[PDB]
Ligand binder design. Structure first.
Ligand SMILES: *Cc1ccc([N+](=O)[O-])c(N2CCC(O)CC2)c1
Ligand SMILES: *Cc1ccc([N+](=O)[O-])c(N2CCC(O)CC2)c1
Lengths: 231, 9, 231, 9
């Protein structure tokens, strides 16, 4: 749909849409930029992630509100709560499928540096995780496996190629721990991963500048916040 | 609990 | 688009969409309900107004962000800020035209009771006011006149048919005062209207129950807040 | 200044 707009104009409009809190527009601009076929820079990857995180975040919040109402209802409330929850769920699944499709065509296969490849594989794990949040039954099993596989490949690369304080490595470990706790019914694995990630980052903080220290410690605090809730 | 949040703007 | 859904199901889904903060959906459900052709109850009118107020509120906030950036730019930033501001502006105008079209086909003409007719004419003034916020030149003049005419007819009915503490009468006067101050370059008329509205409501508070007193005094505080900013 | 806000939900 964005095929007639210059790549650089799509990126500039994505930045404007972020400032205007127009995240659906932002995601459409960034989809158009990806579909130009060139690799994305560090900041362009961040724009892609912010746009879709906000779109799917609104959908997830709405799905949770509707699911809670539906669970309460089961007086006959009619089919409306279920029908509307299903509508939101289908829309959410479509956004996740769109993001996964961008990663598969062709962002991951062209990503050779650790920073880009880990970033995209973490996104792949995240969007399969959002699919898993709404999935049921055997569908849930294969979706869960797909999230786990993406996160595991990202973890393997990050441990070989990035320092333990790298913010992408830290955020990957945070989100994989949430996967273990909330999706995979593995709270002990979640706690172990968060603890080991925190401790290994702590021991590497001495190597960092003031600005990098702030970036890494911010994410470490999120690991600690989860550990406080889980223990 | 909490995953990485989006940055604010 | 909603022609196949029952009126009662559209209303229930609008209430669910409000809970889920899905205001675009809410507005589409309420448009479908209006297009069933029956008059709206008090609470259905409130659902219609809340839905569109939230949709157009997001657009207005985005338009203001983009307009401010555009005004700052006029280094050559390219056409992108203007182009994107224009896109948002056109979308905002389309929402306002949709609301105005519902009021004209056929909510106002079928509204005979003062509470419904004043409510719809206030909405008509409000959505012409939102059009005026983005209009330029001679277009602005006719749009301004249309807002003024709608508000004035609503004021005339409200003064004849409603007590001075009625919340719709109070909110009408509040918004017409904002029109005078922000759109019509008539700050003295805005201040006079807010003061007279406040004083006449104060003198009628003694007639109200505890719950009505809370409703009326909440809007009176908004009139006072504006007077504090304007004087 | 401020017009009537929408109700919260
Ligand atoms: C998954 C992850 C890990 C770290 C960071 N970060 O420190 O920037 C991010 N970004 C947050 C800012 C923006 O939302 C893009 C992603 C993400
Ligand atoms: C314009 C106006 C005046 C008063 C009131 N009110 O006291 O309810 C409203 N409503 C506010 C609640 C809901 O958003 C519908 C409109 C509007």
């Amino acid at each position: 749909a964005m095929g007639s707009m210059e790549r650089a104009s799509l990126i500039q409009k994505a930045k404007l849409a972020e400032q205007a809190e127009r995240y659906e527009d932002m995601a459409a601009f960034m989809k158009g930029a990806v579909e130009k076929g060139e690799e994305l820079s560090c900041e362009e990857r961040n724009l892609l992630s912010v746009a879709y995180k906000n779109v799917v975040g609104g959908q997830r919040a709405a799905w949770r509100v509707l699911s809670s109402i539906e669970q309460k209802s089961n007086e006959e409330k009619g089919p409306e709560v279920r029908e509307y929850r299903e509508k939101v769920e289908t829309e959410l699944q479509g956004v996740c499928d769109t993001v996964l499709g961008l990663l598969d065509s062709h962002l991951i296969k062209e990503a050779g540096d650790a920073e880009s490849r880990v970033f995209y594989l973490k996104m792949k794990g995240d969007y399969y995780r959002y699919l898993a949040e709404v999935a049921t039954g055997d569908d849930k099993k294969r979706i869960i496996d797909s999230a786990r596989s993406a996160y595991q490949e990202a973890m393997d690369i990050s441990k070989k190629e990035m320092p333990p304080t790298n913010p992408i490595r830290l955020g990957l470990a945070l989100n994989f721990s949430v996967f273990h706790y909330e999706i995979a019914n593995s709270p002990e694995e979640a706690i172990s991963l968060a603890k080991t990630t925190f401790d290994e980052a702590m021991a590497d903080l001495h190597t960092l500048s003031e600005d990098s220290y702030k970036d890494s410690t911010l994410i470490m605090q999120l690991l600690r916040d989860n550990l406080t809730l889980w223990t | 609990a909490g995953s990485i949040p989006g940055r604010r703007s």
